[PDB]
Amino acid sequence: MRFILTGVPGAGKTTVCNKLAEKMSNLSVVNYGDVIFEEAKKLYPSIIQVREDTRKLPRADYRNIQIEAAKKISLITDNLIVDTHMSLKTPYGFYPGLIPETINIIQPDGIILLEFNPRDVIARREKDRLAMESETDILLHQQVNRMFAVSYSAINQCYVKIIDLTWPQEYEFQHTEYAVNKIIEMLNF
Amino acid sequence: MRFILTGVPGAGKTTVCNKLAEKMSNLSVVNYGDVIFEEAKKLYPSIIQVREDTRKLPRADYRNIQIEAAKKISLITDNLIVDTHMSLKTPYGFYPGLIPETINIIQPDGIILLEFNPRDVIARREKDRLAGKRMESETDILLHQQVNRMFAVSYSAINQCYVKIIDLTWPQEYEFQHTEYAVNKIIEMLNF
Amino acid sequence: MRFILTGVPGAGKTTVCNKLAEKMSNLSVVNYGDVIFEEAKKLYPSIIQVREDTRKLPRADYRNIQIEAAKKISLITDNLIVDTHMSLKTPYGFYPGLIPETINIIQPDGIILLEFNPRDVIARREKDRLAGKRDMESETDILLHQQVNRMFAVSYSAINQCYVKIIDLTWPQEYEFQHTEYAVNKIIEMLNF
Ligand SMILES: Cc1cn([C@H]2C[C@H](O)[C@@H](COP(=O)(O)OP(=O)(O)OP(=O)(O)O)O2)c(=O)[nH]c1=O
Ligand SMILES: Cc1cn([C@H]2C[C@H](O)[C@@H](COP(=O)(O)OP(=O)(O)OP(=O)(O)O)O2)c(=O)[nH]c1=O
Numbered sequence: 415m416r417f418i419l420t421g422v423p424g425a426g427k428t429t430v431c432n433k434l435a436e437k438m439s440n441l442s443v444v445n446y447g448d449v450i451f452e453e454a455k456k457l458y459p460s461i462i463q464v465r466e467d468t469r470k471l472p473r474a475d476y477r478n479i480q481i482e483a484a485k486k487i488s489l490i491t492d493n494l495i496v497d498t499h500m501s502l503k504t505p506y507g508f509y510p511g512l513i514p515e516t517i518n519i520i521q522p523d524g525i526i527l528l529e530f531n532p533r534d535v536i537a538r539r540e541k542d543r544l545a546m547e548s549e550t551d552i553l554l555h556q557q558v559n560r561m562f563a564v565s566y567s568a569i570n571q572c573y574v575k576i577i578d579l580t581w582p583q584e585y586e587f588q589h590t591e592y593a594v595n596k597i598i599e600m601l602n603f
Numbered sequence: 604m605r606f607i608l609t610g611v612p613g614a615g616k617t618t619v620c621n622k623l624a625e626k627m628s629n630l631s632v633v634n635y636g637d638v639i640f641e642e643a644k645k646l647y648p649s650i651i652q653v654r655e656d657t658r659k660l661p662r663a664d665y666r667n668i669q670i671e672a673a674k675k676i677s678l679i680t681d682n683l684i685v686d687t688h689m690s691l692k693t694p695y696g697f698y699p700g701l702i703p704e705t706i707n708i709i710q711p712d713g714i715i716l717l718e719f720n721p722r723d724v725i726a727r728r729e730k731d732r733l734a735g736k737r738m739e740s741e742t743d744i745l746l747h748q749q750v751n752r753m754f755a756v757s758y759s760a761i762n763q764c765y766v767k768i769i770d771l772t773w774p775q776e777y778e779f780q781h782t783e784y785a786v787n788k789i790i791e792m793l794n795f
Numbered sequence: 796m797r798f799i800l801t802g803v804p805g806a807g808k809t810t811v812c813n814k815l816a817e818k819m820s821n822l823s824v825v826n827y828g829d830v831i832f833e834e835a836k837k838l839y840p841s842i843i844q845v846r847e848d849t850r851k852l853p854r855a856d857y858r859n860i861q862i863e864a865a866k867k868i869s870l871i872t873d874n875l876i877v878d879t880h881m882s883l884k885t886p887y888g889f890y891p892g893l894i895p896e897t898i899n900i901i902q903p904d905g906i907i908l909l910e911f912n913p914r915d916v917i918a919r920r921e922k923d924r925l926a927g928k929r930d931m932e933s934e935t936d937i938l939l940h941q942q943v944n945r946m947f948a949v950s951y952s953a954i955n956q957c958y959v960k961i962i963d964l965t966w967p968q969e970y971e972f973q974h975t976e977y978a979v980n981k982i983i984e985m986l987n988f
């Protein structure tokens with residue numbers, strides 16, 4: 415099966431991927447961003463250095479890089495988790511991390527949303543910082559990602575699975591276990 | 604005028620249809636699932652003889668049955684209200700209760716949403732379970748209705764159709780006052 | 796750049812449009828309803844004479860009007876701000892203000908949603924209902940309308956890969972027109988990036 419895992423940044427969406435890769439073999443977890451970056455570095459070596467450098471690219475060249483990366487990912491032949499973002503905040507607004515080409519090429523069985531509590535995201539981004547959105551911004555962002563998922567579902571006829579993590583953690587990294595277990599229950603169902 | 608009446612199941616969405624049919628001769632109320640049935644058992648009487656059996660069809664046959672149902676419906680000259688679901692909860696998440704085709708074939712003027720209060724929904728589902736006619740919580744129902752709103756808005760943006768939301772969240776003086784309100788609102792919509 | 800500015804009616808959407816068109820250069824602000832009305836008036840002068848005569852037409856003729864408006868609108872400049880409505884409440888339920896064509900013809904960089912607090916909107920509408928410019932919506936009606944505008948914008952973004960910027964003007968003002976100055980600064984900051 416093919417599922418696209420999404421969530422707001424700085425919340426634990428990478429943690430679930432690490433723990434899914436660990437706890438389940440026969441499962442290929444892939445970061446769409448890393449594949450796009452590698453394809454870009456290969457196609458534009460003399461100018462692409464770090465991840466941010468992908469903003470230098472023209473619109474159409476970047477779209478082609480996305481298409482190529484989706485082509486690469488479509489080759490994975492067993493259980494697949496595609497790690498990416500539905501929306502990314504820009505000074506110009508929320509921008510889709512996906513494109514219809516990705517949905518058509520990868521042919522994902524479904525999308526998964528990881529919804530958290532704003533307070534959690536705040537503390538989490540603080541931890542990642544030591545090594546500026548408000549709770550309102552984060553609620554807005556999550557509702558926006560939800561609308562994006564419902565739109566992509568209405569266009570491509572795919573599932574949208576919302577995993578709730580608003581509840582308080584008795585111990586740190588409880589959200590991770592819950593999400594990983596739900597996703598594995600979903601894969602073996 | 605043709606509309607797609609929808610809402611979470613177990614809340615009164617069929618009562619509205621039946622009452623509407625009682626209360627308006629200039630109208631035809633049809634349930635998409637029931638037409639899917641009639642047209643499937645017309646072709647596969649061997650393995651399809653009860654509703655819950657439709658799971659057995661491959662996606663090819665079942666999609667063709669959906670297309671044939673929407674086509675048979677589209678032959679209704681008079682006002683039309685198509686009862687169906689926007690999204691169905693599954694172990695894989697929500698899935699659209701409509702395929703783009705349906706919408707194209709029917710050419711619905713709009714989509715009507717019936718938004719209930721979650722407790723009503725659960726209470727109704729319990730009472731309907733005890734009558735031999737059948738676990739979600741209030742949060743799950745709120746989420747389902749919100750996702751239904753989002754599906755209606757997406758379909759409108761894609762196909763250019765109205766999105767009429769009917770509020771049945773208020774407390775009822777007497778049982779089945781929600782159906783009275785919804786029926787009257789829809790008729791008002793038609794006779795304008 | 797090209798942006799489509801929207802928000803519930805009677806809340807301060809043309810205010811921001813005017814403050815923009817004046818406080819910026821190379822910036823052309825244009826209202827979609829006005830171009831629609833002008834083109835319809837030209838094509839059907841016999842019956843188009845008030846902004847409500849426009850919907851005495853079949854939706855196909857009106858759709859052609861909308862496509863012409865868009866075409867006509869894009870031609871105006873290489874920079875733009877299109878004042879329009881994401882959705883409009885009607886006896887049959889919220890109807891889209893744009894069409895998949897509008898955005899293919901104008902190729903807008905993004906959509907902007909000015910999201911207000913409904914209480915402010917009620918007050919503004921009834922202050923407009925005293926100055927001659929203006930209808931009985933409530934707080935919940937308006938919250939639903941704004942949520943529906945949000946959903947429409949996100950849908951169109953998913954469809955055409957455009958930004959959806961949301962400007963929060965729900966907070967209470969320290970003085971009149973603080974919301975408008977805030978929004979104008981946000982949009983300018985965005986453009987001068
Ligand atoms: C699940 C969880 C994460 N965290 C911390 C660990 C992480 O360092 C931080 C952010 O989670 P990340 O694992 O970094 O999630 P991400 O997808 O946003 O990362 P990336 O920038 O690469 O896209 O949150 C907690 O403090 N408590 C928790 O319960
Ligand atoms: C409208 C209404 C229904 N009820 C009861 C009648 C039924 O037992 C149940 C309503 O369920 P139904 O009216 O039968 O609707 P449904 O769940 O079958 O819809 P769908 O097509 O999606 O499957 O609740 C009330 O008690 N009060 C009410 O106001």
Ligand SMILES: Cc1cn([C@H]2C[C@H](O)[C@@H](COP(=O)(O)OP(=O)(O)OP(=O)(O)O)O2)c(=O)[nH]c1=O
Pocket residue numbers: 802803804805806807808809810811919920922923928929971972973974975
């Ligand atoms: C921003 C703002 C507007 N107002 C008033 C001024 C106007 O009467 C009204 C602002 O709304 P409009 O500027 O008229 O915005 P609009 O184009 O969306 O409305 P319409 O469809 O009617 O053309 O509210 C205030 O009183 N304080 C404020 O801070």
